[PDB]
Amino acid sequence: AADMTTLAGHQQLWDTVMKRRQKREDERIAPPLIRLWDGDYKLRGQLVGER
Amino acid sequence: YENVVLAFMEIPTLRAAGLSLPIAGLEDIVTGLGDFHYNEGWVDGADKAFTISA
């Protein structure tokens, strides 16, 4: 955990929050996971090459 | 009692389980929709056709 007594731990907290912004910025760009299933709901596959 | 007796009918079908269908490649085999399908649909009654033949 970051030290709140010193500027170096305030920098560790800032760096930790900027890290979590980047993970959300990547999940903003990630496509949904698409899956196709048959009439009894058996999985056929994951779809990735769609237009 | 008015419209209580013989006032409705349900007619079933082999669609879920298996049929041969007049589509190229489905004429000789048996295929069904699957265990997951839409259940009921209402037959429109405004001309009373069900009272001549349901």
Please characterize this protein's 3D structure.
This is part of a larger assembly, with two copies of chain A. Chain A is of the alpha+beta class. Helix content of chain A is 41%, strand content 18%. Chain A is built from one helix and two strands. In chain A, strands 1-2 form a two-stranded antiparallel ribbon. In chain A, β1 and β2 form a beta hairpin. Chain A is elongated. Chain A starts with 6 loop residues before the first helix and ends with a strand. The relative contact order of chain A is 0.11. Chains A and B meet through loops of A and loops of B.
Oligomeric form of this entry? part of a larger assembly
Q: Percentage of helical residues of chain A?
A: 40-55%
Our count of helices of chain A gives 1
As a whole number of angstroms, the C-alpha radius of gyration of chain A is 21 Å
Compute the separation of the termini of chain A in Å. 45 Å
Which sequence of strands runs across the widest sheet of chain A?
1-2
Question: What about the largest sheet of chain A?
Answer: 2 strands, antiparallel
Order of helices and strands of chain A: HEE
Total beta strands of chain A? 2
Strand content of chain A: 15-25%
Structural class call of chain A reads: alpha+beta
Q: Tell me, what's the shape of chain A?
A: elongated
Largest interface: A-B, 4 and 6 residues
PDB class: viral protein
Keywords: Bacteriophage, tail tip, viral protein
Entry title: Mycobacteriophage Bxb1 tail tip - Composite map and model
Chains A, B: Baseplate hub, gp25
